[PDB]
Write a protein that binds this ligand. Structure first.
Ligand SMILES: Nc1ncnc2c1ncn2[C@@H]1O[C@H](COP(=O)(O)OP(=O)(O)OP(=O)(O)O)[C@@H](O)[C@H]1O
Ligand SMILES: [Mg+2]
Lengths: 210, 187, 209
């Protein structure tokens, strides 16, 4: 069954289900190894298994499928995807795939996909005739984004000052030049939570490096 | 009289390519008949393959030279019509485009190719004067039926056998397959 | 070769197999081999398919070396240079008749047995055959068999045996698998091919996996 719910759950719940599923010596190793072994024994029983993730293609064309919670780690949780899915199913790099998964047979370390059920929150059928990103003609920042919470929060003054100094917009290209000890990290988290609260339709994610 | 015999040879190799397609289709229907049965032996399967690829290369080149013969006969007919109809009534064409004509006649190479460019644009304008105009037209008056039977657009099978083309090394290896095919036919 | 293996050969295959052993002298091996090859060529003369198996080229080469008289000129290593033509008599019969039938030979070779005189016969027999198969000791140490070193294996004008487009297909596969190691290649090939029934399905799942 779906591995995301057992992936985002904390380690305690995973280990407790580990003891109650019949394997009690699966605590002293990595989270990826724990989930790999638990799902291995679970699929060995012969039950329905569901998977999801984001794919990527190596140099040889054979691809991997990583998970967002694992921070795209090259652990056993990844799923093998063949170039044939790309060649006929017409799936590009990084397409979010959710659907059936196959327990790998002997000599196969990583899982495989049986069939695809959802691609980029859309049906896999109409994803074939999808316009490319670079083929779209761009324009300037037509839309305007407001960073004010509107509830009079105790920290809304920072967002209001940011709006007054430099309004932000959709599809804009902006930089925040700052020396160290500038308080930038928490103002980025503040604008992130502001756009999450004000705009529940647009997708939000934050990239952390080193 | 050369156009008539060229047209006759065009239908000759056209019919040759048609019968090659027929024997090819016989090869694949026999192949599918044997496949639908019990395939105990693979040597027959292997030779059926060998023959179907060599015959499809042969029909590919058959469509190829049929196509080039069709263009050859079309252009020879067009140039014969141009030559003799201008023999009949070239004075009006001469009087119409005189400037670049005298530019060509008694001047040097740069002047001649500039005159060619000038006549090129002038005749493009002349052609588009009546090309966009809506008038009913007939086939080549000398050989209308002869041109209708051959057809301007070739058969869809011509581009079916022209869509796929093998590499020159692959072309010569199919040629040697045809050679050994004739060799085993001699057996 | 030891009688136990040749008798296992006799009892396993339905067809009749000839036998020879160290009890039989070297001249006996030479003469039985030349009757065998002459009978094979007589049989293929009647437009019939004949297959010969040789195990091995080194054993017969040693036998012909022992039985040859001294001609006064000796190739380096204490062997008669002319005598080397006689194993080629036992190997030159390999030819396909276009008018009907064909004679084929499949021969094994032995090297690195502590004998200095084994690798050079392989070197001078390298150009004799149109296809060759390498066996290495590192795979034997790896304990998994067959130790097929197909990465360096090659055939001359093998196109006549397969189709055209599918020939380029396994050649695509060949040069894709060339850069990687010789070992992991063979394990994953045999692993993918093990639980299946026919090689055609292997061909489609090379377009599926
Ligand atoms: N709006 C604000 N309200 C309160 N304190 C603030 C505000 N803006 C900046 N500061 C202060 O500025 C300092 C910056 O702290 P912080 O750890 O957020 O900095 P940072 O620029 O994200 O860090 P670094 O550059 O070291 O990674 C803190 O002392 C913080 O209290
Ligand atoms: Mg910071």
């Amino acid at each position: 069954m779906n591995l995301t719910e057992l992936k985002n759950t904390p380690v305690s719940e995973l280990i407790t289900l580990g003891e109650n599923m019949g394997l009690e010596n699966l605590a002293r190793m990595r989270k990826q190894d724990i989930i790999f072994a638990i799902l291995k024994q679970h699929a060995k029983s012969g039950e329905d298994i569901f998977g999801d993730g984001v794919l990527e293609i190596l140099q040889d064309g054979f691809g991997f499928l990583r998970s967002a919670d694992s921070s795209y780690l090259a652990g056993p949780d990844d799923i093998y995807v063949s170039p044939s899915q790309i060649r006929r199913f017409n799936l590009r790099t990084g397409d979010t795939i959710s659907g059936k998964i196959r327990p790998p047979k002997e000599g196969e370390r990583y899982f495989a996909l049986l069939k695809v059920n959802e691609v980029n929150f859309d049906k896999p059928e109409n994803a074939r005739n999808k316009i490319l990103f670079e083929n779209l003609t761009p324009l300037h920042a037509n839309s305007r984004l407001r960073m004010e919470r509107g509830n009079g929060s105790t920290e809304d003054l920072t967002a209001r000052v940011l709006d007054l100094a430099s309004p932000i917009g959709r599809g804009q290209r902006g930089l925040i030049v700052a020396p160290p000890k500038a308080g930038k990290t928490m103002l980025l988290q503040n604008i992130a939570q502001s756009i999450a609260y004000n705009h529940p339709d647009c997708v939000l994610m934050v990239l952390l490096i080193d | 009289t050369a156009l008539q015999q060229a047209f006759d040879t065009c239908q000759n190799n056209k019919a040759a390519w048609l019968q090659r397609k027929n024997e090819l289709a016989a090869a694949e229907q026999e192949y599918l008949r044997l496949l639908s049965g019990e395939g105990r032996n693979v040597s027959r399967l292997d030779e059926l393959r060998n023959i179907i690829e060599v015959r499809k290369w042969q029909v590919n080149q058959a469509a190829g030279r049929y196509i080039r013969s069709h263009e050859a006969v079309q252009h020879i007919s067009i140039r014969d019509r141009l030559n003799d109809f201008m023999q009949q009534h070239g004075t009006a064409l001469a009087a119409a485009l005189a400037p670049e004509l005298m530019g060509y006649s008694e001047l040097t190479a740069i002047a001649r190719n500039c005159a060619i460019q000038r006549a090129t644009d002038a005749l493009r304008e002349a052609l588009l004067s009546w090309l966009a105009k809506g008038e009913k037209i007939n086939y080549s008056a000398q050989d209308s039926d002869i041109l209708t039977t051959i057809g301007f657009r070739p058969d869809v099978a011509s581009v079916d056998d022209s869509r796929e083309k093998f590499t020159p090394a692959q072309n010569m290896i199919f040629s040697r397959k045809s050679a050994q095919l004739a060799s085993r036919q001699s057996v | 070769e030891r009688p136990e293996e040749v008798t296992e050969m006799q009892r396993l295959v339905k067809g009749e197999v000839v036998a020879s052993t160290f009890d039989e002298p070297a001249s006996r091996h030479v003469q039985v081999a030349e009757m065998v090859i002459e009978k094979a060529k007589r049989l293929v003369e009647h437009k019939k398919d004949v297959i010969i198996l040789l195990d091995s080229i080194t054993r017969l080469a040693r036998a012909y070396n022992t039985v040859v008289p001294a001609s006064g000129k000796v190739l380096t290593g204490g062997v008669d240079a002319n005598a080397l033509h006689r194993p080629k008599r036992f190997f030159g019969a390999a030819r396909n008749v276009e008018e009907g039938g064909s004679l084929t030979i499949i021969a094994t070779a032995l090297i690195d047995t502590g004998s200095k005189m084994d690798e050079v016969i392989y070197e001078e027999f390298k150009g004799t055959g149109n296809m060759e198969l390498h066996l290495s000791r590192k795979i034997a140490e790896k304990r998994v068999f067959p130790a097929i070193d197909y990465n360096r294996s090659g055939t001359r004008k093998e196109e006549l045996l397969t189709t055209q487009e599918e020939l380029q297909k396994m050649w695509i596969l060949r040069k894709i698998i060339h850069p990687m190691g010789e070992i992991d290649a063979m394990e994953f090939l045999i692993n993918k091919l093990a639980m299946t029934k026919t090689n055609d399905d292997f061909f489609e799942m090379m377009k599926r996996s």
